[PDB]
Design a protein around this ligand. Sequence first.
Ligand SMILES: [Cl-]
Ligand code: NI
Ligand code: NI
Lengths: 325, 331
Amino acid sequence: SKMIAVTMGDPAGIGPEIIIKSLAEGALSGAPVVVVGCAQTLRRILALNITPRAELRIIDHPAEASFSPATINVIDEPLSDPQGLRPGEVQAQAGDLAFRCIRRATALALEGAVAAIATAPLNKEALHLAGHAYPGHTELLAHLTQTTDYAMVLYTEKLKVIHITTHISLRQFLDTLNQPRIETVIGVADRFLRRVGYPRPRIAVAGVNPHAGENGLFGDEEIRIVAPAVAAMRAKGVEVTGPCPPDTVFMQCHEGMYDMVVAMYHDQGHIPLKLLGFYGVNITAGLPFIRTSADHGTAFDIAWTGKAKSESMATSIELAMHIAQ
Amino acid sequence: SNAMSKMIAVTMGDPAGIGPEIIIKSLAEGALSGAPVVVVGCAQTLRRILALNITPRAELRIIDHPAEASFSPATINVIDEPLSDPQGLRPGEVQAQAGDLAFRCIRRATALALEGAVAAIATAPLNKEALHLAGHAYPGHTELLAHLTQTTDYAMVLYTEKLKVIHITTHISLRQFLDTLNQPRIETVIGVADRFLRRVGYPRPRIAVAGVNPHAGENGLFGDEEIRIVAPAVAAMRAKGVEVTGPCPPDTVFMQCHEGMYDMVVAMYHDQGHIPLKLLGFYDGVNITAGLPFIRTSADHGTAFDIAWTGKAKSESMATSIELAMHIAQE
Ligand SMILES: [Cl-]
Ligand code: NI
Ligand code: NI
């Protein structure tokens, strides 16, 4: 039984309650999931009657987990002051816990004690206040695993995408586009797909401009940057093609012509995925293990009220499990 | 005529291209057999195509005016706009007489649409080089139609029952889109969208405007086009009573429209609007040139001189464009 670790995230946010909701009932009840988090915090949430009931089984190591419906196995990573934590506020002890849970889960994944991680949201202000000077999970995970090259993947059965960049302006994407990064991401895609079991991954690389530039009629990015990256990776034995017209390449992948598309920018890849009804499926590819997450924040405005939806947390756990098993 | 609806015109386009054969295939059989469609084109060219046995059979009914049409299955009503030398025309070659015909059919059909004799035009493709060689200095249909109807403000619409999109920009580089994005154009396109949908019969169209940057900028974290250009356009049009909202995150706005939250999305650039439509299966690129005084449609195919007059060109997109023109024309 391949296990998933789930990190608590910021305990003052919605992470604790969406973890309990995800694991206490429904499809993931009794699933092989180990929570790395503050057990006392989980108990405070349970006492507020804002989630289904659950028994906690505290453990020291994933190999000591015992899975059953309505029980949550927890490796306790304690807050310094669990009873003093205030809901929905930026607190150093909360940012510190978010960091420590990621650190501990990462160590377990690197040892092979768990197969993958699914992360609950952290608050970057609190993370920084606690002395952890990372923009977010991605840079922290990269540091803890000595991973230089990584990229965001959206993963569904029929359409998979990996992104050259994500949360930057469209203009910045154009002004930073570069051949080394595209080659790197093609390589990350190939290794990622091999590791999920595709012996000979078929990868398509999207162009930048309409019609992939129509032979230079629109822009020069395809001839000067994208096509040379494709050629270099084809020479290195990757089954990669492109540049491909953006408005047909995702369609082609969805129809089974390719296993994954390399999208040039956030919306190029996100628009098609979310239209197909995937509004929990993001993977940080390139790390030594699979890491999933949801696109939502800590939601301090509603934290500890039971209003936050747990579906994206559950979807991220399900995805990690699916790939691991 | 014996139409039970408004009629539309179909223009032949460049006769040396695939226009003639895809018109015949569209109208001679299948869904549009007997439909209230009048072809404006060179009848002798259609007869040359029929004699090549590269299409289904069809009887031609030549007429002088749409009101004199008589619609029936496997018959095509044609207002004959003749080539200067129909028997000398060569398939799949740039020829002045072909460009001249393409122009004349558009001119004649436009006059009929403006007079109300037909309610829309669906165009077959023309060849720009031939159009220019015939002394008609236009990049293509859109500019020619805009000129003949004195239309300044227009935009490309993709139309399905669940997802409709109108474009700020289309065939330009992403960099040129970013360098030329301006508030007046966005206001104009919102206006074109509102008028188009009200005409269709949506008294209070719900229009969403897509952002430029991821998360529509995320309150400025990922760029400022939304704050400086797009949001002011939306506010200006809301002040004119348009039910317009945005800027919206690009990766959720098309999905929301598709789910029924909005009637139409204003897309900022070509791929932003084209990726979602082609993913849902609409790969033919049928589109409406919105803002003209009448409905005009077309498919995204060219003249395909490589296969012209061989019967290999697919007619499905032509048929879909005729069907869409006919449908939208009924409002
Ligand atoms: Cl109308
Ligand atoms: Ni995002
Ligand atoms: Ni196009």
